[PDB]
Paper text:
Of particular interest is the Bdellovibrio bacteriovorus HD100 nucleoside diphosphate sugar (NDPS) hydrolase Bd3179 because it appears to have some of the characteristics of the Escherichia coli adenosine diphosphate ribose (ADPR) hydrolase and the guanosine diphosphate mannose (GDPM) hydrolase. Bd-NDPSase is a homodimer whose monomers are related by a non-crystallographic 2-fold axis. Each monomer comprises an N-terminal and a Nudix domain. Phosphate release assays revealed that among the nucleoside diphosphate sugars hydrolyzed by Bd-NDPSase, its highest relative activity was with GDPM.
Bd-NDPSase crystals soaked with UDPG displayed electron density that could be interpreted as a glucose molecule in each active site of the asymmetric unit. Modeling of glucose, sulfate, and glycerol molecules in the unbiased electron density revealed that these molecules are located within hydrogen bonding distance of catalytic residues. The glucose molecule is shifted toward the expected position of the phosphate of a phosphohexose product.
Author numbering:
A (entry chain A): 1 to 182
B (entry chain B): 3 to 181
The structure:
């Protein structure tokens, strides 16, 4: 699909807020003309599906101000210092929920904002869990819950798992639990 | 008791396409924090199902990630119109199709950490093939895809666009008679 590609002619960081950094590019498109492209520069991230011995998954409730609501999510966070995302996933599982896992499996990489961010999220399945203690940052507010996967799938259908990364996790888990994808 | 209360708001950035809101909020610890996110108008995406059982999809280059994606057609809400209007227009502009049977599936939030974007996903059936009407700067190829092939592509990591991957999973549930 080389005939669809756009070639970068110029780049600049047009804005840096408290948290968000925006790149503004000029690109040459397949018509040979020049167009502006704008996107957030994001470090990447990891999310995991932590599957307990009893078959439930460990999830969280977290308020997200950008949408003004509380979401049911799988634990996740941003990639720090360009680390391997497996390290990101281990740290975030520990900090957000207090769990460690003996068995980690990479599932897939998703891109949640292809129109305006370079963000990718690596999704992992975590098994053989043991509990320790949740360790939250100042400014981080998280309630931990156990969810039955059948109940999760019904919530997806009902529109109650609108967070894309978590919904995608639910569908990958469903495939895994049914023995279709493993 | 997780809800954060807005103390102030301002639009700190407006570029060619992106707008950033910055709020001061009071959190459950009673302390003040900054929250920063993209102001997005919302969007629709749709899954156009053909009588031969294939779905209409697109290939589109996405500069933010520097690759070509397989996507279901989509676009941004214009002038706070109903997202079904958005879906009808974008299906016609991006793919050249019209549909007489539309069904809302679900609403997703692709960027809960830093955008208020929502995308409403629809299933479209009973299709007529007219022609694309692309905007300047828009480059899209239309392809026809077998759902079984799509699901294998998802497994292989070749449908990394969250909205399209989600559409694939919903379609799989619909086709399997489960939902
Ligand atoms: O899952 C996302 C959460 O973790 C990430 O590290 C980010 O800092 C922010 O978006 C939120 O705190
Ligand atoms: O699907 C997304 C596409 O459509 C939307 O209307 C936006 O303008 C932009 O992200 C892209 O051109």
């Amino acid at each position: 699909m080389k005939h669809l590609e756009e070639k970068t002619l110029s780049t600049r960081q047009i804005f840096k807020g408290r948290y968000l950094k925006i790149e503004q590019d000029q690109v040459q498109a397949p018509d040979g003309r020049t167009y502006t492209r704008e996107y957030i520069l994001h470090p990447g991230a990891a999310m995991m599906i932590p599957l307990l011995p009893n078959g439930n998954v460990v999830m969280i409730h977290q308020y997200r101000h950008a949408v003004k609501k509380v979401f049911l999510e799988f634990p996740a966070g941003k990639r720090d210092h360009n680390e391997e995302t497996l390290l990101t996933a281990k740290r975030e599982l520990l900090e957000e929920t207090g769990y460690e896992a003996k068995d980690w499996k990479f599932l897939t990489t998703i891109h949640p904002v292809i129109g305006y961010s370079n963000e990718h999220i690596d999704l992992y399945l975590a098994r053989d869990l043991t509990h320790l203690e949740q360790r939250l940052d100042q400014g981080q507010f998280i309630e931990v819950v156990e969810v039955k996967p059948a109940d999760l799938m019904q919530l997806v259908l009902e529109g109650k798992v609108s967070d894309v990364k978590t919904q995608i996790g639910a569908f990958w888990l469903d495939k895994f639990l049914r023995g279709e994808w493993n």
